[PDB]
Amino acid sequence: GEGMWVPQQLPEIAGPLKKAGLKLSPQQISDLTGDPMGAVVALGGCTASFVSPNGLVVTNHHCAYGAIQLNSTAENNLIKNGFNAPTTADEVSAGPNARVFVLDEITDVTKDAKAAIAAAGDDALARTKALEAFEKKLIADCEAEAGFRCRLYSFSGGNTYRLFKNLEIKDVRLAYAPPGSVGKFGGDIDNWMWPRHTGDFAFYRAYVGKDGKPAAFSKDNVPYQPKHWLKFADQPLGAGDFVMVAGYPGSTNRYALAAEFDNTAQWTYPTIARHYKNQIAMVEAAGKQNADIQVKYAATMAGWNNTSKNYDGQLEGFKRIDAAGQKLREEAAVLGWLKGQGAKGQPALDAHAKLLDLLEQSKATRDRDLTLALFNNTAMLGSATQLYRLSIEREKPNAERESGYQERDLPAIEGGLKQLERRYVAAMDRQLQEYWLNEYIKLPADQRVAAVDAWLGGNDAAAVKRALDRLAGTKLGSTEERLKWFAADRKAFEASNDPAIQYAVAVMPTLLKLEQERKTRAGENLAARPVYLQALADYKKSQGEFVYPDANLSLRITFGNVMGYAPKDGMEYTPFTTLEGVVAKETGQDPFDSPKALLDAVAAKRYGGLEDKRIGSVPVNYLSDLDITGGNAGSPVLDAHGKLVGLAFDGNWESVSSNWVFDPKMTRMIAVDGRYLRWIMQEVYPAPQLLKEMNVGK
Amino acid sequence: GEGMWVPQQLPEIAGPLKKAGLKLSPQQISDLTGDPMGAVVALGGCTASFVSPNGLVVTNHHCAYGAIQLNSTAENNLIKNGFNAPTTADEVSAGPNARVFVLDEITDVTKDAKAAIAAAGDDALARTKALEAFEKKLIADCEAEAGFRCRLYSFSGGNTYRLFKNLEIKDVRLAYAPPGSVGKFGGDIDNWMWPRHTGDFAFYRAYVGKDGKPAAFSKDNVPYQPKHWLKFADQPLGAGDFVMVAGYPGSTNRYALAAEFDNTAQWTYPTIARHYKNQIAMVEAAGKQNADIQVKYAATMAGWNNTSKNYDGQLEGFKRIDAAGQKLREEAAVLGWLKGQGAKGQPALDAHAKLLDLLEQSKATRDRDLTLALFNNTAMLGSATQLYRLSIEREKPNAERESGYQERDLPAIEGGLKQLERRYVAAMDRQLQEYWLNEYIKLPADQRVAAVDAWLGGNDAAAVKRALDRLAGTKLGSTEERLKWFAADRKAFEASNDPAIQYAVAVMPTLLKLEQERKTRAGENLAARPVYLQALADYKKSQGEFVYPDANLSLRITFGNVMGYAPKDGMEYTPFTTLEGVVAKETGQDPFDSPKALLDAVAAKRYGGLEDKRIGSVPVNYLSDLDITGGNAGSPVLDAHGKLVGLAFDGNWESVSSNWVFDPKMTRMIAVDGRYLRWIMQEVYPAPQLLKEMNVGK
């Protein structure tokens, strides 16, 4: 069912958990450093988990793809063939940017965070700056212990703040990956789709120094020895059984105001989808012509194409369940309940009204803001503005620097700067500059930016050509020029005759004013949002509903049951797929080209002792009514006894709307069954040492 | 499961019947004039049944479609609106061609038939003619009492012969029909499809004279009083429950030789498909700017579509299931077994070789025979050749006239020649003549017909155009002129300058020679087929299996259980559809335009006391693993106690291939649930007096 619950609130939902079938105590699972929640780890974008007392980590295949590719040659293709390390000495480095983060300590810092905000009085900009400062000092002081990375998370609009201190493991090595036609069986064709037959798993091992402390790759490091780790289920998972997922969903916006949601559906999503489709067509058209373009812009185009299809998909989904109407009616109920109460209801009504006013304010300049932002996100303008901005911040002391530009941020910046070379071709970037300039000159007089207008020196076709021609002369194309600016001082930037840097210098005072305006609105939001969300929570309580905060990168549990769904009368998706289902999709061409040893074993009905007779086969994937979103790939699925029954890896297309809604009839997570991991590792691409390490071998 | 069981054999499958859930005794349901089976009646191409002691009869809506349309006018459009007769005086005549045939008596005549055949000796043609003589006398004797029509059926290639004497009711009236968007919801879109949501039912009432004998329509007639009629189930039908169907399946070819099957799949089906699509195209093109054509050729075009699509989808089914390989392999086993028998097995092996030889004889002229038969079946040539043939037969004693051309056949002939008016337009029929002649002159020289060659005077497009010009002068376009020829002497035909007549007179000697060749072949088949089929039966029995004869238009029982099917891993069709499914398909446009009272009742959940809580609604249609074919439309579906739970009206698209094989996994009948009939009659298009008559009033 719906909900991304923080572990601390699980005792409060004891009743719902027990009814769904949970057999462990909610008090046990509420401990974020305990058994099993302390086994759950973050990879930076994916979830994973510990599965042995010697640092073995399981996650999805696409979560490990980076590492698999990295250790692949032109002439030895782990992507195709799989990877296996028969001893730990055979495990290969995932490279110096790979991480496993493990929770060390959590602290509720709400009282301190609220005091700092409260000290700013009625000054909205001051409130923002005060929270910024609180956070930066907190993180600094927490991270003064080497080995650790800290994060401050705000819950429910700032009703609650929590500080997480994570051990930062920096020597992560690949231990196993199934072949690519298992890991990614069905490729993009089966993306978002059920029925699903994908063995989406892989294994790392975490390493530390012999002193126990994190260290970069070294042959003297040894496996990390986790305090907690997960065990394979010994009861066979069946339709209707309790399941829960623990993982790190990135962000949701489940409590958006009716007007905010309407603006997203009516303007934001259609407008962004449009520009994205125009960009896609431009890149498609040029990559045919050219070919450097084709290879370097392929991932950028895929990103646009992805967002574009998901926005279109959500808009249809909304109309399908009347999400806007449902939201409007619940909001009306809330406002009615508050209005009924006297004076006592007024602060929350006032807060609702302030939230509406801020949405009008950001709506008044929505076209300008989007155009300027995406114009400045083109490659040469992006790097110019980012570099110049850094040089301004450098000229203050670190403690005053804008997050993103502190000393902790510099590796990330240099990272991006080097990466840019993989996705930049000047002929193509000129076309993207042109597109965004033509969007710019379509803005009304009252949405223009004087500094840009003055730079452009006119606003017809010929103005834009002159401007493209000037910018052509920049030298920030090359990595090596860019690295010189990364270290250059503000007055160098101001002396430069580089036409991209001169753009940056011309517009920066304006960009800073716009930034200050966002921060001002954001400080008003600090005041009004928690108040409104508390009133929402109180209303829901009166109605007997428990409330969960929006996702915010922290560890959450979602629970429910293994179950199919039926989009149409007279048919149902069954909760499981099976081995025979995989073979029935064989074409053998990419992406339906299973390994031969899989075809042979299924034909032989070598079930490896893993069959579930209720389904007549070994299970492959299954559906459940769990509530996940981006961040949850790789999350472990646990059973009623907190034992591992699979990994989360996708959802059905009805899950594409997970930022905004959950449809209990149709939304389903797709998981790969723990028995299918075992079956692949027994019958297809053998990992006897891992099976034994996990006590299911052996 | 598989099998179209003759009732007389039901005692010998007591075990399977009971295992499947039958609660009546096998003996009781074997009784063809008893309860319930004596309630089942034939309409001539559809099955129906009695459902009251005052002669009320239920069947499908497309079975009653002729009657509905006949009583329809633009001002009162019964097809669209439905029909109800609240009193028996309101019921309207289904027309002079409508029939209800009620079984009076069956006799096994196998001994006298086999004797008549034996007395003709070794001459194949004489054997056919002996069987013809036997059959004609038998029927003449049986029909001597007014009011009855009789038929002789041969089972299992002539192993058994039975004579059925039926009361021929000729006054049939429409009592109820649901609106068209209920009777045919989904139209041709949902045809052969599941999920299905179609209320495919209608009611008639059978009338006889006040003396109790059959009579043509008269207002002095009164309702027939049946000895046995079905009652509605009092038990709610659920998933897994026993169901059976009784009706008159037309033809199957489940025991064909591998080479007979191959000929059909490789030649017959693809050839016919192709011709029919050519014809369908010409008729659809011509109809777009001539609506006389389009109105009059619509039944005809839809006949072609049905066969075309069925053959295209049998052919797919054959490949899905490797039907070719199955047959060859199964025939391999039988032949091996037979060789394993003594001398004992030699007759069946000789029979097998004979049948192969007959097949090669038929194949040597297959193109000639099909082209000439389809040419001659165009409207004017069909009419001329038939009317000339009749004049030839009228010159013999009735006893010696060909079946189809006896006294007893005359109304049916006169029927046909009147009804041709409804489906003929000269300029369309010319295009059809032209297609077929163009096929004719494309024939290989050794597949030509000397008489057609002489009449053409050449073998080219020029000769074709001359023939069409010649034929266009016929007078047989008018009903009046056809009825003259109906009555004419053969001398008159042979003196006629009517060019269609001239054609018939020129070709008839040929047609009678080809008829004689067919009959000679059938005379050989008469000897070989039953020996081979008896061998297949013995073989099947040596392997522990029960055997049933191919369909031959006689009454059969098929039994099984309510069940869905799963065509892909990860999904299932559920056994029932529901009211909410009807409404989810609504578009407001034909064919997905339910009556508003339907939409209103489902929205208010007026389930009228008919809901089955196991499916959360009133059921609509359901699937089961019964074995039906063409002729079974309208068959009553009965439960374990012999009570009415549905009507058969279609099958899923996977069957179709059924003619050649029954696929236990995928073959399903689609029925309309008796609750849905009740529901429509209560809540949508009300007939409280009929439900009262059926003891299901509220």
Ligand SMILES: [Zn+2]
């Ligand atoms: Zn512990």
Ligand SMILES: [Zn+2]
């Ligand atoms: Zn972290």
Ligand SMILES: [Zn+2]
């Ligand atoms: Zn805490």
Ligand SMILES: [Zn+2]
């Ligand atoms: Zn109900």
